[PDB]
Amino acid sequence: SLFELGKMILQETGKNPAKSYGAYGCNCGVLGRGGPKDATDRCCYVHKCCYKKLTGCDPKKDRYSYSWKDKTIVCGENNPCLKELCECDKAVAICLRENLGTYNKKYRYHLKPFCKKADPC
């Protein structure tokens, strides 16, 4: 769920997820997708595309279990959907950290109506 997800982002990036992400660019947050503005936004694009594969569980609500061993996110549990869901979250968290270099605070609350039509996943 958003709790695990936000904790992961915090753990990888070291940044406050709700603040730095959650309304960033055309993809990070709740307005759906759009043509990515930068690498960071591309991470959220892929993240939302990863979610379109989940069969049987809810990303926004369903909780799952993961461990933080040696500063590595580790997804672990039988439920296939949750395992998948967890891999999606882990991946964007890592993607976000890897693109910290070009994070642009000016896209932080970017007006989504200024966005272009997002290519289909």
Which of the following is catalytic: 70, 89, 110, 119? 89
Is 41 a catalytic site residue?
Answer: no
d(CA 6, CA 16): 8
Q: Where are the alpha helices (DSSP H) in 1-121?
A: 2-13, 17-20, 39-51, 80-98
Please return the burial class of 29, using the count of CB atoms within 10 Å of its CB with bins 0-12, 13-18 and 19+. middle
d(CA 4, CA 104): 24
Which of the following is catalytic: 38, 41, 47, 70? 47
> Phi, psi at residue 73, to the nearest 5°?
-75, 130
The dotted CATH code for 1-121 is 1.20.90.10
Q: What is the stated resolution of the deposited model, in angstroms?
A: 2.5
SS3 (DSSP) at 92:
helix
How many other C-beta atoms are found inside a 10 Å radius of the C-beta of residue 55? 7
User: Residue 63 in contact with residue 4, Cβ under 8 Å?
Assistant: yes
First to last CA, the chain: 22
Domain extents for the chain? Answer: 1-121
d(CA 83, CA 79): 6
* Length of the chain counted residue by residue: 121
Write the CB contacts of 37 (distance below 8 Å, at least 6 apart in sequence).
Answer: 25, 26, 104, 107, 110
Which is nearest to 76 in space by CA: 2, 27, 4, 19?
A: 4
CA 97 to chain centre: 11
Is 89 a catalytic site residue?
Answer: yes
